[PDB]
Design an enzyme around this catalytic site. Structure first.
Site, PDB file in Angstrom:
ATOM      1  CD  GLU A 114       9.561   0.475   4.900  1.00  0.00           C
ATOM      2  OE1 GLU A 114      10.966   0.090   5.061  1.00  0.00           O
ATOM      3  OE2 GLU A 114       8.963  -0.265   4.704  1.00  0.00           O
ATOM      4  CG  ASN A 155      13.429  -1.033   6.689  1.00  0.00           C
ATOM      5  OD1 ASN A 155      13.648   0.339   6.536  1.00  0.00           O
ATOM      6  ND2 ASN A 155      12.155  -1.382   6.284  1.00  0.00           N
ATOM      7  CB  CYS A 180      12.211  -1.005   2.115  1.00  0.00           C
ATOM      8  SG  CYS A 180      11.900  -2.708   1.908  1.00  0.00           S
TER       9      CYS A 180
END
Ligand SMILES: C[C@H](c1cccc2c1CCC2)[C@H](NS(=O)(=O)c1ccc(Cl)cc1C(N)=O)c1n[nH]c(=O)o1
Ligand SMILES: Cc1cn([C@H]2C[C@H](O)[C@@H](COP(=O)(O)OP(=O)(O)OP(=O)(O)O)O2)c(=O)[nH]c1=O
Ligand SMILES: [Mg+2]
Length: 644
Positions: free
Chosen positions: A346, A342, A344
């Site tokens: 994570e 995604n 970010c």
């Protein structure tokens, strides 16, 4: 600044109604135009008034005074609903709205959540805080997707998906390897001009400009051009500066870099299916295409390596993800090959043309579980996790999905992502230097605790509501938990045997559970260091260091810290125990950072938004850093490179 906040909070209480239900009525009856545009949902209001006496009396307005200055000003700006440009909601009003928005008619649950949130044991994600108790409650933080098809039809269907999602406050991760490259037959302009379209779409659909992370596998023929797209020097037609960039990296690439072997760049239309298999299966498919000469260009793996590192030195990107580690250690591997992470880095969730994966997120404030004894309260940590799981689990069922593939996916698999903030604060409060062996055991045991609590709750929910639809055949279904996949044995802290018995009996409700996100906004609101990151610097002056020195009557001094960009290492009066405790990220070994990420990682069934802080980076340093991370088994080896 302490006094400044009190004044600010006071001023807001003076300028706001005190009774929570009165503020909920005002917000609903809001009128622009002259059209009734309710700022909160009818359902929520109907419920709030039905329980107004208990709900209004549950609220503790002195908790508004716990917010630090900049945290409080962040709240006014973005998180407190406004009537006509003027704040109507006190922070406690907003938390109860959030609480009732999630829990609805279950007043006991709503007040339990209210109390946990207002005492700052944990927080929900910004989108939840924004839209809970509202019409079109888009509570989920970000999204992941695969290109629908290698056709104008699928490309433009995916662009619209992205535009709709971005408009509804979602960040995006996009898998684009299946799209054919430059110069390629059509019975093709390729990737760069396609990404320009996505770039302008991010700019057009915000206010914060649309946040799209593009995931490419380094075998793609356009890989070198991909790596230039974020560079602040070039022709407008060759660039896309508003996008974010990630590599989805096979073991085979890193192996050949390490051994100075050749690397073949392929067109996905000629060499299909490389993104639908991982590990050994990929290595066979890839090798077989090389031997068939279905290969558009051959470079030294090391030439592409160098360009990856050049790119990072310049822009801090691309993000480094290890495809094979992500897929090998995923509870979602029963669904097929995971094609991306995604925005970010994570979240590690499955996507297909039918499924847009969703990130349902919250973060625990690890600072809060340290006792005055300087002991960590693991039991309490696990109890709060159980609540967050129940909350996030309900959010899947109430969320307004911006595309139906997001709905199908989230309901099918029910993944959640529980993170943390205040890791660096919890170490400071326990008197453990970030790198110390003590911090290292505590690091392990915090995430063991989180994972344990999460599973127990998810198991309890499965007892009650039955397992998630694709549960049968997952690693968890066969008794394999995340730490098993890393060949790690947990410490003696928790009884896993007992837990694995319950899981074997009932199942779990959620395919995935844990995922430390960046917590950039919420950490600031709560007054904690962000996620799992070290203390970034000592300057306001840092409240723990300030307190520690004040207590020792060693508090001129604010000025010498400014002089050294937040280090207290040079200053001669401060004793050596405090110096160890308050090393900044620049004085902290990134090798140790990486090792600690790996050690936690065994109890993280998704991945971690792991930034890397190298002060004076060069080619060797970055090479060593990456290979170390990859060899440790990390799923995400680097989010952002940050430099001094
Ligand atoms: C690049 C290198 C590194 C990072 C990750 C894995 C590995 C290395 C070198 C061997 C394996 C890294 N060098 S560094 O980043 O320049 C650095 C060294 C020491 C200190 Cl106290 C601070 C910093 C810093 N943050 O700026 C490192 N961390 N630990 C270590 O021994 O080197
Ligand atoms: C038509 C067209 C396609 N493309 C790209 C988008 C896709 O990656 C790829 C295929 O587009 P398609 O729309 O699939 O074109 P096609 O149906 O003629 O090709 P085929 O029969 O070989 O499937 O070409 C361009 O870059 N420019 C164009 O003008
Ligand atoms: Mg086609």
């Amino acid at each position: 600044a302490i006094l400044a906040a009190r004044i600010a909070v006071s001023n807001l209480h003076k300028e706001t109604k005190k009774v929570f239900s009165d503020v909920m009525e005002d917000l609903y009856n809001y009128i622009n135009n002259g059209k009734h545009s309710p700022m909160v949902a009818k359902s929520t209001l109907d419920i709030v008034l039905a329980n107004k006496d208990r709900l209004n009396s549950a609220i503790i307005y002195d908790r508004d005074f716990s917010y630090n200055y900049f945290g409080f000003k962040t709240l006014e700006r973005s998180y407190l609903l406004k009537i006509n440009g003027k704040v109507a909601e006190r922070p406690q009003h907003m938390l109860m709205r959030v609480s009732v928005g999630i829990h609805k008619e279950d007043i006991d649950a709503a007040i339990e959540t209210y109390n946990l949130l207002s005492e700052r044991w944990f927080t929900h994600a910004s989108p939840t805080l924004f839209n809970a108790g509202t019409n079109r409650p888009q509570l989920s933080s970000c999204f992941l997707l695969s290109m629908k098809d290698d056709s104008i039809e699928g490309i433009y269907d995916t662009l619209k998906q992205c535009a709709l999602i971005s408009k509804s406050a979602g960040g995006i991760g996009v898998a684009v390897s299946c799209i054919r490259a430059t110069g390629s037959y059509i019975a093709s302009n390729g990737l760069v001009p396609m990404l320009r379209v996505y770039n302008n779409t991010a700019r057009y659909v915000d206010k914060r400009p649309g946040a799209f992370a593009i995931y490419l596998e380094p075998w793609h023929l356009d890989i070198f051009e991909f790596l230039d797209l974020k560079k602040n020097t070039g022709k407008e037609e060759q660039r896309a500066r508003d996008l974010f960039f990630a590599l989805w990296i096979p073991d085979l690439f890193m192996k050949r870099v390490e051994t100075n072997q050749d690397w073949s760049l392929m067109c996905p239309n000629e060499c299909p299916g490389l993104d639908e298999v991982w590990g050994e299966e990929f290595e066979k498919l890839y090798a077989s295409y090389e031997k068939q000469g279905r290969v558009r260009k051959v470079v030294k793996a090391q030439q592409l390596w160098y360009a990856i590192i050049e790119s990072q030195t310049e822009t801090g990107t691309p993000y480094m993800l290890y495809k094979d580690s992500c897929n090998r250690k995923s509870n979602q591997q029963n669904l097929g090959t995971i094609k991306c992470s995604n925005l970010c880095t994570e979240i590690v969730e499955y996507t297909s043309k039918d499924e847009v994966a969703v990130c349902n997120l919250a973060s625990l404030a690890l600072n809060m579980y340290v006792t005055s004894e300087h002991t960590y309260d693991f039991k309490k940590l696990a109890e709060v996790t159980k609540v967050v799981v129940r909350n996030l689990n309900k959010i899947i069922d109430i969320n307004y999905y911006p595309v139906p593939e997001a709905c199908l996916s989230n309901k099918r698999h029910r993944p959640i992502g529980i993170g943390v903030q205040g890791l660096a604060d919890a170490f400071i409060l326990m008197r453990y230097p970030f790198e110390s062996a003590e911090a290292q055991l505590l690091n392990k045991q915090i995430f063991e605790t989180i994972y344990y609590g999460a599973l127990e709750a998810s198991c309890d929910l499965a007892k009650e509501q039955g397992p998630y639809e694709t549960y049968e055949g997952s690693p968890v279904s066969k008794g394999i938990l995340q730490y098993d996949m890393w060949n790690v044995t947990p410490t003696d802290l928790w009884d896993w045997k007992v837990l694995k018995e319950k899981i074997a009996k009932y199942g779990i409700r959620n395919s995935l559970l844990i995922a430390p996100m960046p917590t950039a906004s919420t950490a600031q609101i709560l007054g904690n260091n962000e996620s799992i990151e070290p203390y970034t610097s000592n300057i306001i002056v840092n409240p723990h260091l300030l307190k520690d020195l004040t207590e020792r009557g060693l508090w001129e001094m604010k000025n010498q810290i400014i002089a050294c960009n937040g280090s207290i290492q040079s200053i001669p009066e401060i004793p050596d125990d405090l110096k160890q405790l308050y090393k900044t990220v620049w004085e902290i070994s990134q090798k140790t950072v990486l090792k600690m990420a790996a050690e936690r990682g065994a109890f993280i069934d998704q991945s971690q938004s792991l930034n890397i802080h190298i002060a004076e980076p060069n080619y060797g340093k970055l090479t060593s850093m990456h290979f170390y991370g990859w060899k440790q088994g990390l799923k995400t080896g680097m989010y952002y490179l940050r430099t001094r």
